[PDB]
């Protein structure tokens, strides 16, 4: 194949190797000027060499460091963007929570006057619980939304009818009436039904999205904590450092040889098949938050849904009075007057009024929401192939080292030169079992890969279910249904140690695993500890999150006390 021209030089000259590695800070006395009268090579073929064993080991470490730099920088970007998506999403929610709250204060102070002003804490208290629910700390928002209307009927009604006496029996009656006469649509119309349904189902869809982004952030952050195997460091030495130790720095690796080496180095790709399903859960959910579960629309609509209920309260005041002064007790005599009511009192200070509507935010607020869901949708989708791109990037960079040539021309194949022909395996560790250059047994994926793969699926199920507007009190079904899911299994370490008269610290006979371990003390889900297990106990380390708890058994040795 075609390639660049070369200068005639002494065959396998190690002086040239010294020029290349001396620039990297290698001690010059570790590299002879000509091939050493020994082989000294263990990872590279065992032949005469320019590398002392120290030089060979330095190259293994240097190539491993170069490898890690290309993976970690691309991972730091993904972690950074996941944090950026998270922060940007939360800031508009916090903003609209505050903007709606002020606009409601302006709306109700003028439209309802003292009826609102004396009770503003109740209306603003709701907003604090909208935020607490968003953070999963105030999940009892549904009861807060029910109590909101009970408090209003208890406290606004006596101000509408202040001629009547309201002992606590009537006040408590008014608070109960709201729950029984909302069924008849009298004290607030159907507004309580509108308010309670829209807010809760929108917030769980948004909360699921926040939880998903955090799940991804923590999945990727620990995926980079998967160590580089010693087999990878040796395969990387075969990739780059070996022809240099043979005194030929011009030979650089075939892309197909490289891809197999790098794919074997990346066991973290066990996260990949659930990474796609996890991002699909976010993407479907993101589309739902654009309109029917748009929180920014919901936030403003709170004002209208409450104002409608308070208008029904004033309109149906006579109808509510008919219930209050029969169910709570008889009417109070009052100094009612006939003929004509007095004219209303006016104020010397200019009074103002305003009206809110259930319209989506406009101009900058509307376009920021539109851009938010565009940035969330495109950036998440593009990073779906991240785990595959890790393998392609490292070997694309290695191709460009020899950009003046093609693999049609001879390239380095680990132990020699030519064109690489064996196949390149796919992704996940399952395909790395078939890897011809760096074989990896898929039976033992790394701990972050095992634990975080589970988290991706749990998030997937919740986000797709919440996309329907379903509460997050559902299940981890992959059918978006109420069927049960998750569970997993756990094992523990039983230990025994006499408390008295001997004071022996606890030690296992054996940890009873699913199979009972060597002591055969198990039954699948059952775990048994046998033998001289007096003064026994157990240590349980949960596998889904690092949590460790202890227990003890009342089997103290005691002796002939």
Author numbering: 19 to 579
Which passages does the manuscript contain on this structure?
To validate the binding epitope of CT3 on GPC2, we conducted negative stain electron microscopy (EM) to visualize the structure of the GPC2:CT3 antibody-binding fragment (Fab) complex. The representative EM images in Figure 3B show that CT3 formed a stable and rigid complex with GPC2. To obtain maps with a higher local resolution, we performed particle subtraction, followed by additional classifications and three-dimensional (3D) refinement. The final 3D reconstruction, with a resolution of 21 Å, showed that CT3 interacts with epitopes from both exons 10 and 3 of GPC2. Surprisingly, CT3 strongly bound not only to the C-terminal region (exon 10) that was used for immunization but also to the recombinant exon 3 fragment of GPC2, which helps to explain the reduced reactivity of CT3 in normal tissues. First, we determined CT3′s binding to each peptide by ELISA; however, no obvious reactivity to any linear peptide was found, indicating that CT3 may recognize a conformational epitope in exon 3. CT3 showed an appreciably stronger binding to the mixture of peptides 10–11 and peptides 14–15 than other combinations. We predicted that the residues 148–162 (LRDFYGESGEGLDDT), which are found in peptides 14 and 15, could contain the CT3′s epitope in exon 3 of GPC2 based on the EM structure. Interestingly, the helix that comprises peptides 10–11 is close to peptide 14, suggesting that the binding of CT3 to exon 3 needs the interaction between these 2 regions. Overall, we demonstrate that CT3 binds, at least in part, to a region of GPC2 encoded by exon 3, a unique sequence predominantly expressed in tumors but undetectable in most healthy tissues.
